[PDB]
Write a protein that binds this ligand. Structure first.
Ligand SMILES: *[C@H]1O[C@H](CO)[C@@H](O[C@@H]2O[C@H](CO)[C@@H](O)[C@H](O)[C@H]2O)[C@H](O)[C@H]1F
Length: 302
């Protein structure tokens, strides 16, 4: 067996990753534990639109490169996050609509992807485009108001910008097979595959909690999306209370699906999370391993 999460995941050809924040990189406990345990990194905030293009046409990759460089220096691959999203847009992009916004969205994808061309294994090209609830509608945003084709255009733009990256659609509350949101995403991906839209992967955020609880049918969700001809990935995992049983279940669901590339938990210690009050991660505040860590490692080791 293997003694760390990333190495244990690698025995089945998968990765075990985390979100990394540039502001925490002077914390020796964080950097040593993150370096030891994970083989995949996602920048927590540094590769988002506001951080990378603070003013139109004026890119700033300083903080993003700090995360990227840390990952490569520590032997990890990197998931880019995220190129088109309604949340966290810089004010200059919030003022744009229609065709002007479309051009800025395209320019933003091209500029960020060119900087990291051939260096990023997966990109979350589009994030959180569906509304929550029973409707299955697209979320309202300046991007969605520019037309239903905004998502497809982002994907076609990204494929041309860097043909070596796996292009993913990412979202939350899409893990339970029976939910309307899950079905809306499923039909979009099915449609994309029939029309030749270049989508290679689907990211399941996996923010499990009392209001959006884990269900055993997540495995069915993963299998059904994989059958559409896309890879699947667990991208921002955290579970309220960090129950060992649920952490083991999610891990085993990924291990049972051949195209489940790996799992990323959203943070290292409970105190590093935005949801620290629900103590939803695998390491305690002092860096020690909880019960959930042991369960995940055991599952990865079979
Ligand atoms: C999935 O959910 C995580 C947690 O909400 C998002 O990461 C958070 O993003 C916000 C907004 O940019 C930040 O304030 C938090 O520090 C960060 O943890 C992630 O982007 C999203 F895809």
């Amino acid at each position: 067996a293997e003694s760390t999460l990333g190495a244990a995941a690698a025995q089945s050809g998968r990765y075990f990753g985390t979100a990394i924040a540039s502001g925490r990189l002077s914390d020796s406990t964080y950097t040593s534990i993150a370096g030891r345990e994970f083989n995949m990194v996602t920048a927590e905030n540094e590769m988002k639109i506001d951080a990378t293009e603070p003013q139109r046409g004026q890119f700033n990759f300083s903080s993003a490169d700090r995360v990227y460089n840390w990952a490569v220096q520590n032997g990890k691959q990197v998931r880019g996050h995220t190129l088109a999203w309604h949340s966290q847009q810089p004010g200059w992009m919030q003022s744009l609509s229609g065709s002007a916004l479309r051009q800025a969205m395209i320019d933003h994808i091209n500029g960020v992807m060119a900087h990291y061309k051939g260096k990023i294994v997966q990109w979350d090209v589009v994030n959180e485009a569906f509304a929550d609830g029973s409707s299955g509608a697209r979320r309202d945003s300046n991007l969605q108001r520019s037309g239903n084709d905004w998502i497809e255009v982002a994907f076609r733009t990204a494929r041309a910008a860097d043909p070596s990256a796996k292009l993913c659609y990412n979202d939350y509350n899409v893990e339970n097979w029976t939910w309307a949101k899950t079905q809306a995403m499923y039909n979009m991906v099915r449609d994309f595959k029939q029309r030749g839209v270049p989508i290679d992967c689907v990211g399941f955020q996996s923010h499990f909690n009392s209001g959006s609880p884990y269900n055993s049918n997540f495995r069915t969700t993963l299998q059904n999306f994989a059958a559409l001809g896309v890879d699947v990935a667990i991208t921002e995992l955290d579970i309220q209370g960090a129950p060992a049983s649920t952490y083991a279940n999610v891990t085993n669901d990924c291990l049972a699906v051949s195209r489940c590339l790996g799992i990323t938990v959203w943070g290292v210690r409970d105190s590093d999370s935005w949801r620290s009050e629900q103590t939803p991660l695998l390491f305690n505040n002092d860096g020690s391993k909880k019960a959930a860590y042991t369960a995940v490692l055991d599952a990865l080791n079979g």
